[PDB]
Amino acid sequence: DKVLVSELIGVDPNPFTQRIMIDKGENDGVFVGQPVLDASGLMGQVVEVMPYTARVLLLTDTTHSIPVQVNRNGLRAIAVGTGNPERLELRYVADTADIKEGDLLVSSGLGQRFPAGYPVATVKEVIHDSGQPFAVVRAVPTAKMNRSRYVLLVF
Ligand SMILES: [Cl-]
Ligand SMILES: [Cl-]
Ligand SMILES: [Cl-]
Ligand SMILES: [Cl-]
Ligand SMILES: [Mg+2]
């Protein structure tokens, strides 16, 4: 309910991370695990808190996964980071699933880490794989990620 507005003050230059720094911390009530989003998508979660600043792991990090669903039909999937700043991939989507380019993915909340129903990404590509149970699904985050103005922290 309470939303704190923070500024993105750093992008972790480590090429192997998608990680940012924000200008709110312990003194502002920020906590580890806290969800972070912008006006068009979920961004990720707080992973470390300092007195007036914090570190945030983005959805696009290879170590990050978020349960999602296709907004229009409720089809469930896990969206993993690819290490690319503007790409996610969906796991566990049946090769024959009702999914297509332009479909909106929203948070499902099924991991009890993120609020349900918020935009996460749009499907970019579906690639079918003969003999494999799951389709290849690439998606683009709707958040501005390493480019957001107002980074919002949900209480
Ligand atoms: Cl904490
Ligand atoms: Cl949709
Ligand atoms: Cl990628
Ligand atoms: Cl979740
Ligand atoms: Mg980095």
Three-state SS string over 107-132 comes to ECCCCCCCCCCCEEEEEEEEECCCCC
Rounded Cα gap, residues 17 and 58, in angstroms: 9
Resolution in A: 1.5
- Asked whether this chain's domains 3-60+145-154 and 65-141 adopt the same fold, the reply is yes
Residue 126: Cβ within 10 Å count: 17
- Could you tell me which residues are annotated as the binding site for Mg(2+)? 12, 14, 17
- 138 sits in which H/E element: strand 136-141
Q: Which ligand is nearest to the CA of 29?
A: 1
Q: Domain spans of the chain?
A: 3-60+145-154, 65-141
Q: Which amino acid appears at position 142 of this protein?
A: T
The CATH architecture of the domain made up of 65-141 is: Beta Barrel (2.40)
Class of the 3-60+145-154 domain? mainly beta
Longest Cα–Cα distance in the chain: 54
Distance CA 112, CA 144 (A): 23
Q: What is the 98 CA–ligand 1 centroid distance (Å)?
A: 40
Find the helix or strand (DSSP H, E) in which 43 lies: strand 41-49
Give the distance (Å) from ligand 4 centre to CA of residue 75.
Answer: 15
C-beta atoms surrounding 74 within 10 Å: 9
CA-nearest of 96, 91, 87, 105 to 128 is 96
- Secondary structure of residue 145 in the 3-state scheme: helix
Q: How close is the Cα of 47 to the center of ligand 1, in Å?
A: 9
The amino acid at 3: V
Method: X-ray
Residue with tokens 């909106």: 104
Q: CA torsion 83→89→92→98, rounded to 10°?
A: 170
1 CA from centroid of ligand 3 (Å): 34
Best CA proximity match to 50, nearest among 33, 75, 28, 78 = 28
Which residues share a beta bridge with 154? 3
